[PDB]
Design a protein around this nucleic acid. Structure first.
Ligand code: MG
Ligand code: MG
Ligand code: MG
Ligand code: MG
Ligand code: MG
Ligand code: MG
Ligand code: MG
Ligand code: MG
Ligand code: MG
Ligand code: MG
Ligand code: MG
Ligand code: MG
Ligand code: MG
Ligand code: MG
Ligand code: MG
Ligand code: MG
Ligand code: MG
Ligand code: MG
Ligand code: MG
Ligand code: MG
Ligand code: MG
Ligand code: MG
Ligand code: MG
Ligand code: MG
Ligand code: MG
Ligand code: MG
Ligand code: MG
Ligand code: MG
Ligand code: MG
Ligand code: MG
Ligand code: MG
Ligand code: MG
Ligand code: MG
Ligand code: MG
Ligand code: MG
Ligand code: MG
Ligand code: MG
Ligand code: MG
Ligand code: MG
Ligand code: MG
Ligand code: MG
Ligand code: MG
Ligand code: MG
Ligand code: MG
Ligand code: MG
Ligand code: MG
Ligand code: MG
Ligand code: MG
Ligand code: MG
Ligand code: MG
Ligand code: MG
Ligand code: MG
Ligand code: MG
Ligand code: MG
Ligand code: MG
Ligand code: MG
Ligand code: MG
Ligand code: MG
Ligand code: MG
Ligand code: MG
Ligand code: MG
Ligand code: MG
Ligand code: MG
Ligand code: MG
Ligand code: MG
Ligand code: MG
Ligand code: MG
Ligand code: MG
Ligand code: MG
Ligand code: MG
Ligand code: MG
Ligand code: MG
Ligand code: MG
Ligand code: MG
Ligand code: MG
Ligand code: MG
Ligand code: MG
Ligand code: MG
Ligand code: MG
Ligand code: MG
Ligand code: MG
Ligand code: MG
Ligand code: MG
Ligand code: MG
Ligand code: MG
Ligand code: MG
Ligand code: MG
Ligand code: MG
Ligand code: MG
Ligand code: MG
Ligand code: MG
Ligand code: MG
Ligand code: MG
Ligand code: MG
Ligand code: MG
Ligand code: MG
Ligand code: MG
Ligand code: MG
Ligand code: MG
Ligand code: MG
Ligand code: MG
Ligand code: MG
Ligand code: MG
Ligand code: MG
Ligand code: MG
Ligand code: MG
Ligand code: MG
Ligand code: MG
Ligand code: MG
Ligand code: MG
Ligand code: MG
Ligand code: MG
Ligand code: MG
Ligand code: MG
Ligand code: MG
Ligand code: MG
Ligand code: MG
Ligand code: MG
Ligand code: MG
Ligand code: MG
Ligand code: MG
Ligand code: MG
Ligand code: MG
Ligand code: MG
Ligand code: MG
Ligand code: MG
Ligand code: MG
Ligand code: MG
Ligand code: MG
Ligand code: MG
Ligand code: MG
Ligand code: MG
Ligand code: MG
Ligand code: MG
Ligand code: MG
Ligand code: MG
Ligand code: MG
Ligand code: MG
Ligand code: MG
Ligand code: MG
Ligand code: MG
Ligand code: MG
Ligand code: MG
Ligand code: MG
Ligand code: MG
Ligand code: MG
Ligand code: MG
Ligand code: MG
Ligand code: MG
Ligand code: MG
Ligand code: MG
Ligand code: MG
Ligand code: MG
Ligand code: MG
Ligand code: MG
Ligand code: MG
Ligand code: MG
Ligand code: MG
Ligand code: MG
Ligand code: MG
Ligand code: MG
Ligand code: MG
Ligand code: MG
Ligand code: MG
Ligand code: MG
Ligand code: MG
Ligand code: MG
Ligand code: MG
Ligand code: MG
Ligand code: MG
Ligand code: MG
Ligand code: MG
Ligand code: MG
Ligand code: MG
Ligand code: MG
Ligand code: MG
Ligand code: MG
Ligand code: MG
Ligand code: MG
Ligand code: MG
Ligand code: MG
Ligand code: MG
Ligand code: MG
Ligand code: MG
Ligand code: MG
Ligand code: MG
Ligand code: MG
Ligand code: MG
Ligand code: MG
Ligand code: MG
Ligand code: MG
Ligand code: MG
Ligand code: MG
Ligand code: MG
Ligand code: MG
Ligand code: MG
Ligand code: MG
Ligand code: MG
Ligand code: MG
Ligand code: MG
Ligand code: MG
Ligand code: MG
Ligand code: MG
Ligand code: ZN
Lengths: 118, 16, 59, 131, 204, 122
RNA sequence: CGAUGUCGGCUCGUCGCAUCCUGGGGCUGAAGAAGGUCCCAAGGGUUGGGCUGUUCGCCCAUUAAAGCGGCACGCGAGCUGGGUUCAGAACGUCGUGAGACAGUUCGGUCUCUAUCCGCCACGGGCGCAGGAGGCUUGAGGGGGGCUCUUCCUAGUACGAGAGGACCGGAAGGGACGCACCUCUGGUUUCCCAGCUGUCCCUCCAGGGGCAUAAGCUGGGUAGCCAUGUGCGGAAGGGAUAACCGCUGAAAGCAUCUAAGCGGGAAGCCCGCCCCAAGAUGAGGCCUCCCACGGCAGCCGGUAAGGACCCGGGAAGACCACCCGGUGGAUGGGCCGGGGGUGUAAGCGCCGCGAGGCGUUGAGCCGACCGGUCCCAAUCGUCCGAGGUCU
RNA sequence: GAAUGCCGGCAUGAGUAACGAUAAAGAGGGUGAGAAUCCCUCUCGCCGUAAGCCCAAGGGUUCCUACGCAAUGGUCGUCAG
RNA sequence: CGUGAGGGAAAGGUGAAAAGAACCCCGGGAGGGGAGUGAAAUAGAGCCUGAAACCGUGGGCUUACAAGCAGUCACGGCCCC
């Protein structure tokens, strides 16, 4: 069955699903708002809050750790120097998934937005 | 249980 | 298998009777508390961009 | 209603603190109570801890001896009321947490892969120096 | 015929006389009685117990009216115990002392759509030697022209679990009345956090 | 967990070296023989001029198993091999010594001669 | 014959009883134990191997026993394809020959999609005279039903001895079943570490991709598991079977019977567990709304409730079920704990160096036990009684 | 009214199997009546004795560009052999 | 369609006259709705007539305790004339 298992499969294998999260982390941290299907969005909250949290920490350890996923020294800088300080006083919940009302024409996929909170 | 072996009536269905 | 195959043509009754569950349910919709347009609940109103009091996206 | 807490409560009456700490690789001696016929004695079992699997009260550790040319592994509940005492007899430095790999090893091979944990030995001799 | 509602909490082993006894722990008490079935009124004899207090918001008028005929606070679950008429108007773990034997009733872990192997212990087919796509399949399900049909209750694949299961004659290892706990030697149906029924056994 | 076809080491001076289980003497249809259970076996390898020879059909008791045997105290004990000691129809050892530890379960099953002959009873 | 696929095996069974075992029996050329024989009994059970395509059979080791049979010699729109009907090839044999043989031998295409009935599951609809939320009785039906060993009685009754009980009483097994994950033992697709080659980020260090749909190797939580653990068969009440009687005529005797009454099986009925009021014969109990407006009817607005939508769930294919929706701990984050990995990086020190020591059980860290409104269950909408007649 | 008749039309199975290698996608920005499918960027993955390149057979305008989207494309199409 | 010899279809009808629908509206287009032509526009080009199967909308009667080659005989009920 499935009892007490955590983690959507998203019809991707191990590597592909990790990329899908990473390349969505880069895209969320680049523009601060991306539209996606509701499933991928809900899974995006936790993957990114970890990265934001680690930036809020700030040590060299946390930057190199976040570097395993984001891989972009300039983008990590944006995260630590501009993004993370916005949330020094916030206790988690740095992201937000609100649902949209129109669907994709091609496949009817229901969509939602994911944005970094104020 | 039949003691005299029973011959088959059909050949194996052979690809046309 | 050995290619199952229908025995009798299904009647105009039996195929229509099968389709008794095939009717669609009309989309479930509520008014938007800001602009009053019928929208799906728990979605950002696609006509004014508002949700939960404030504006969220440009429509 | 906290359910791990309730379970933690039930186990409390059986928990032990009196036993020393010891990691995989530590050679050790478990003085164990055995019921042989109509009497009960303290059979000792002395060997290398090759595994320690924690689950709160339900943690257990495995100790491996060589008895008369035959390997013997023995599993103990860490809070068994039949554990009289445990005596650390040597501190070994392992690199892994489970040491099943030492099953397929000669005696010389094991002495190389498991050297004396000098840091935990010196801490041991430094402790026990109480006044 | 004493009985009590409670949730199953988890499994452990205590130690008792140089023997480790596997137990499962049940938060049994306490259960206010909210209606009594009598032969005059209802034809049979049983006590309606309640369990777990509930947010009065979430309880509709008819249900809330039921509690008021008895002066019981809104509770989450209501359940009857048949041929039980306790003296007090609150059943607690105290009605069970160690040494006793109990029957425990609970909703089993649902395995969903179960194939014929997990459900009915069938053997399936070979995994080589020519076996063709029937590795977890049942085999024949009938005969031929006679009877030319499949027997009712023919064991097949389908849903399995999340059904009522009563496991019987379990020793009551301990009772912690201060905590409303109830130890029980062995296995009890249902997952942790599932509502079970503990009754006096029917064995010898 | 000894089942038919399982090879066992013989822990005694009966001549035998390996025996191969062909039956566990535990009633009608028992699946495996653990410590203390009796087995009929076939002598597959044996030293020359022993009390038993290659190809005999002997009985033996399983003294130690490579699957771990559990105990009511909560402990368990596995050995490095599956071993047995050739016995007679009166449960008595057919040799004069036994080699290597034997599980304490033999005593509770009534094999006191073997248990006394051992070097260690774990 | 405009096709009813043919042996054996595998799988899944079910039925019969001319009963292999377990239960109850009468006769015995029945001392006892153990047999023979016949009667009742189909509840459950009836092992694993060697040989041969084999069914069958013989044999090995056991067993309470290793039953015989029907179901298209049950079962190929379930599987197999060793045997047997194709085409190749050879041996013996027959034939001048082409070839042929209940004579051998090697080889040799078994079809993804279920319409109807049937079976396993799961819903939608209406109905059960008012509309609703709970809790229930159980007509009826299914599941289950096995058995061994040792010990006490007692080395007693019995027997020359050898042997060796009835009855009653305790303990421990085998196989099977239901549930369970504390323990034992698995898995644990990215939870941690180590490692090779190559490309890259950013030169060093540190890291990433790829080598599988985990590159590989050592480990591994919860969950799902069995090899692991708990529990089941019964107890018992009743009616009987064969069989044994009581009292007893017809028939002064006798007779278990013709009046009547006892006793008596693992079998029958209740009992145990599970389904169950579509049980249309649609049951019962507790509780909630209630005389709404307009021409056994109709159209509308409502009540108690309900549904929708959303956050979800050891529930689950969808559906259903269960939980929650800010007056909230439902999921996500975050903190604590658990647990896994087994001492991160950075720097210091030691060594020419690969390395080592220390900071340090550190660093990282899925699911488990919790806390915390930081993020997301916003705001709402639609249904929904006014109660037939004697 | 029947010939497993001939031609044609329309049903059934059924909203069912399938939609043609498990190399793999993600977002942002354009275009537009309309976009998962067209263009641009960045990220990610796949081939690299090829899944790159050049020639021969064969094919015969498929090449380039502009304007289009009924049908062809197994979906879509603003794109296209 | 076949390498080739060779095989070998389907496909007729607006109206007397194009007077073949300017212009307006919805639509991206297709398609419609108006206006207009004609004796006639379900003669509007997918065009005389326009059958049947087959699909669908509205209406009347009927149907969720019922056992069937589907009808037929009787009677009752409702709807219509
Ligand atoms: Mg499954
Ligand atoms: Mg499930
Ligand atoms: Mg799976
Ligand atoms: Mg969860
Ligand atoms: Mg993951
Ligand atoms: Mg998939
Ligand atoms: Mg995919
Ligand atoms: Mg898919
Ligand atoms: Mg990979
Ligand atoms: Mg996390
Ligand atoms: Mg830094
Ligand atoms: Mg990290
Ligand atoms: Mg929607
Ligand atoms: Mg589209
Ligand atoms: Mg036969
Ligand atoms: Mg043919
Ligand atoms: Mg087939
Ligand atoms: Mg096939
Ligand atoms: Mg099939
Ligand atoms: Mg049909
Ligand atoms: Mg028809
Ligand atoms: Mg119709
Ligand atoms: Mg039709
Ligand atoms: Mg049909
Ligand atoms: Mg816990
Ligand atoms: Mg050693
Ligand atoms: Mg070293
Ligand atoms: Mg329950
Ligand atoms: Mg199973
Ligand atoms: Mg099962
Ligand atoms: Mg099972
Ligand atoms: Mg098998
Ligand atoms: Mg198998
Ligand atoms: Mg095949
Ligand atoms: Mg095949
Ligand atoms: Mg198949
Ligand atoms: Mg296969
Ligand atoms: Mg068939
Ligand atoms: Mg029939
Ligand atoms: Mg269920
Ligand atoms: Mg018991
Ligand atoms: Mg748990
Ligand atoms: Mg609960
Ligand atoms: Mg030895
Ligand atoms: Mg000794
Ligand atoms: Mg024929
Ligand atoms: Mg013919
Ligand atoms: Mg025919
Ligand atoms: Mg045919
Ligand atoms: Mg046929
Ligand atoms: Mg055979
Ligand atoms: Mg008998
Ligand atoms: Mg008898
Ligand atoms: Mg007899
Ligand atoms: Mg006798
Ligand atoms: Mg005699
Ligand atoms: Mg008979
Ligand atoms: Mg029987
Ligand atoms: Mg062989
Ligand atoms: Mg042959
Ligand atoms: Mg034969
Ligand atoms: Mg016998
Ligand atoms: Mg017997
Ligand atoms: Mg046999
Ligand atoms: Mg049979
Ligand atoms: Mg047959
Ligand atoms: Mg076949
Ligand atoms: Mg066959
Ligand atoms: Mg068939
Ligand atoms: Mg073959
Ligand atoms: Mg063949
Ligand atoms: Mg052959
Ligand atoms: Mg001649
Ligand atoms: Mg000749
Ligand atoms: Mg001649
Ligand atoms: Mg021949
Ligand atoms: Mg023949
Ligand atoms: Mg012939
Ligand atoms: Mg032959
Ligand atoms: Mg070959
Ligand atoms: Mg069907
Ligand atoms: Mg039919
Ligand atoms: Mg059906
Ligand atoms: Mg229903
Ligand atoms: Mg009624
Ligand atoms: Mg009602
Ligand atoms: Mg209700
Ligand atoms: Mg009931
Ligand atoms: Mg009943
Ligand atoms: Mg019925
Ligand atoms: Mg019954
Ligand atoms: Mg029985
Ligand atoms: Mg005696
Ligand atoms: Mg004697
Ligand atoms: Mg007895
Ligand atoms: Mg059975
Ligand atoms: Mg666990
Ligand atoms: Mg586990
Ligand atoms: Mg485990
Ligand atoms: Mg484990
Ligand atoms: Mg990772
Ligand atoms: Mg660069
Ligand atoms: Mg480097
Ligand atoms: Mg690398
Ligand atoms: Mg690359
Ligand atoms: Mg590559
Ligand atoms: Mg790859
Ligand atoms: Mg490989
Ligand atoms: Mg890797
Ligand atoms: Mg692994
Ligand atoms: Mg686990
Ligand atoms: Mg685990
Ligand atoms: Mg088991
Ligand atoms: Mg008399
Ligand atoms: Mg009488
Ligand atoms: Mg008598
Ligand atoms: Mg009686
Ligand atoms: Mg019995
Ligand atoms: Mg019930
Ligand atoms: Mg009802
Ligand atoms: Mg009911
Ligand atoms: Mg009836
Ligand atoms: Mg009726
Ligand atoms: Mg009712
Ligand atoms: Mg009643
Ligand atoms: Mg569940
Ligand atoms: Mg669902
Ligand atoms: Mg769901
Ligand atoms: Mg409900
Ligand atoms: Mg609700
Ligand atoms: Mg609410
Ligand atoms: Mg609300
Ligand atoms: Mg929460
Ligand atoms: Mg939380
Ligand atoms: Mg730890
Ligand atoms: Mg270090
Ligand atoms: Mg370091
Ligand atoms: Mg370092
Ligand atoms: Mg230096
Ligand atoms: Mg740690
Ligand atoms: Mg932690
Ligand atoms: Mg609070
Ligand atoms: Mg609103
Ligand atoms: Mg005719
Ligand atoms: Mg035809
Ligand atoms: Mg013809
Ligand atoms: Mg025509
Ligand atoms: Mg035709
Ligand atoms: Mg057509
Ligand atoms: Mg069609
Ligand atoms: Mg259609
Ligand atoms: Mg469908
Ligand atoms: Mg179909
Ligand atoms: Mg295809
Ligand atoms: Mg499909
Ligand atoms: Mg494709
Ligand atoms: Mg490929
Ligand atoms: Mg594909
Ligand atoms: Mg593949
Ligand atoms: Mg490749
Ligand atoms: Mg895009
Ligand atoms: Mg912009
Ligand atoms: Mg597109
Ligand atoms: Mg488009
Ligand atoms: Mg894209
Ligand atoms: Mg795009
Ligand atoms: Mg694509
Ligand atoms: Mg980017
Ligand atoms: Mg190359
Ligand atoms: Mg190319
Ligand atoms: Mg050319
Ligand atoms: Mg061409
Ligand atoms: Mg081009
Ligand atoms: Mg086109
Ligand atoms: Mg197009
Ligand atoms: Mg065109
Ligand atoms: Mg298209
Ligand atoms: Mg195509
Ligand atoms: Mg365009
Ligand atoms: Mg051509
Ligand atoms: Mg041509
Ligand atoms: Mg031709
Ligand atoms: Mg025409
Ligand atoms: Mg327009
Ligand atoms: Mg316009
Ligand atoms: Mg266009
Ligand atoms: Mg137009
Ligand atoms: Mg017009
Ligand atoms: Mg006119
Ligand atoms: Mg007109
Ligand atoms: Mg006309
Ligand atoms: Mg006309
Ligand atoms: Mg004309
Ligand atoms: Mg016309
Ligand atoms: Mg209508
Ligand atoms: Mg109609
Ligand atoms: Mg009716
Ligand atoms: Mg009826
Ligand atoms: Mg009818
Ligand atoms: Mg009839
Ligand atoms: Mg008829
Ligand atoms: Mg009449
Ligand atoms: Mg009439
Ligand atoms: Zn709005």
């Amino acid at each position: 069955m499935r009892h007490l298992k955590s983690g959507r499969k998203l019809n991707r294998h191990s590597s592909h699903r990790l990329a899908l999260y990473r390349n969505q982390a880069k895209s969320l941290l680049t523009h601060g708002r991306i539209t996606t299907t509701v499933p991928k969005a809900k899974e995006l909250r936790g993957f990114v809050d970890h990265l934001i949290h680690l930036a809020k920490r700030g040590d060299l350890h946390a930057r190199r750790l976040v570097l395993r996923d984001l891989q972009d020294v300039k983008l990590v800088r944006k995260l630590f120097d501009e993004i993370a300080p916005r949330y020094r006083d916030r206790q988690g919940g740095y992201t937000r998934v609100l649902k949209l009302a129109e669907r994709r024409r091609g496949d009817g996929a229901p969509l939602a937005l994911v944005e970094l909170v104020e | 249980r039949r003691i005299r072996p029973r011959p088959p009536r059909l050949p194996r269905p052979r690809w046309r | 298998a050995k290619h199952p195959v229908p025995k009798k043509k299904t009647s105009k009754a039996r195929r229509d009777a099968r389709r008794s569950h095939h009717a669609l349910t009309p989309p479930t919709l509520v008014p938007c508390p800001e602009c009053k347009a019928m929208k799906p609940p728990h979605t950002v109103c696609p006509e004014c961009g508002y949700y939960a009091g404030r504006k969220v996206l440009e429509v | 209603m906290n359910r791990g807490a309730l379970i933690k409560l039930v186990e409390s009456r059986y928990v032990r603190t009196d036993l020393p700490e010891f990691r995989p690789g530590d050679t050790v001696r478990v003085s164990y109570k055995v019921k042989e016929g109509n009497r009960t004695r303290i059979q000792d079992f002395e060997g290398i801890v090759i595994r320690i699997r924690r689950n709160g009260f339900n943690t257990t550790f495995t100790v491996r001896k060589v008895s008369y040319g035959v390997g013997v592994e023995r599993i103990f509940p860490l809070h068994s009321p039949l554990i009289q005492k445990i005596d650390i007899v040597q501190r070994g430095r392992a690199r892994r947490a489970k040491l099943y790999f030492i099953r397929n090893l000669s005696d010389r091979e094991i002495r190389r892969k498991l050297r004396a944990d000098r840091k935990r030995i010196d801490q041991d001799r430094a402790a026990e120096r109480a006044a | 015929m004493k009985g009590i509602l409670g949730v199953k909490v988890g499994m452990t082993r205590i130690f008792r006389d140089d023997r480790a006894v596997p137990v499962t722990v049940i938060l049994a008490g306490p259960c206010p009685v909210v209606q009594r079935r009598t032969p005059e009124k209802d034809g049979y004899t049983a006590v309606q117990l309640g369990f777990l207090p509930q947010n009065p918001k979430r309880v509709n008028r008819p249900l809330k009216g039921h509690f008021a005929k008895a002066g019981v606070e809104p509770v989450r679950i209501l359940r009857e115990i048949r041929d039980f008429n306790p003296e007090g108007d609150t059943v607690t773990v105290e009605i069970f002392k160690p040494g006793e034997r109990v029957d425990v009733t609970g909703t089993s872990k649902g395995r969903g759509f179960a194939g014929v192997m997990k459900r009915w212990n069938f053997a399936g087919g070979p995994d080589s030697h020519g076996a063709h796509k029937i590795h977890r399949h049942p085999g024949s399900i009938g005969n031929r022209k006679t009877p030319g049909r499949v027997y009712k209750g023919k064991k097949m694949a389908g849903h399995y679990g999340a059904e009522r299961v009563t496991v019987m004659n379990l020793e009551v290892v301990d009772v912690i009345p201060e905590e409303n706990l109830l130890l029980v030697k062995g296995a009890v149906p249902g997952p942790n956090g599932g509502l079970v029924i503990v009754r006096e056994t029917k064995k010898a | 967990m000894i089942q038919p076809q399982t090879y066992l080491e013989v822990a005694d001076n009966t001549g035998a070296r390996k025996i191969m289980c062909i039956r566990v003497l535990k009633g009608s249809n028992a699946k495996y023989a653990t410590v203390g259970d009796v087995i009929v076996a076939s002598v597959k390898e044996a030293i020359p001029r022993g009390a038993v020879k290659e190809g005999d059909v002997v009985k033996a008791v399983v003294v130690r198993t490579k699957k771990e045997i559990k105990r009511p105290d909560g402990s368990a004990i596995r050995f490095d091999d599956n071993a047995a000691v050739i016995i007679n129809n009166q449960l008595e050892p057919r040799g004069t010594r036994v080699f290597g530890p034997v599980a304490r379960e033999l005593r509770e099953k009534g094999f006191m001669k073997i248990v006394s002959l051992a070097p260690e009873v774990l």
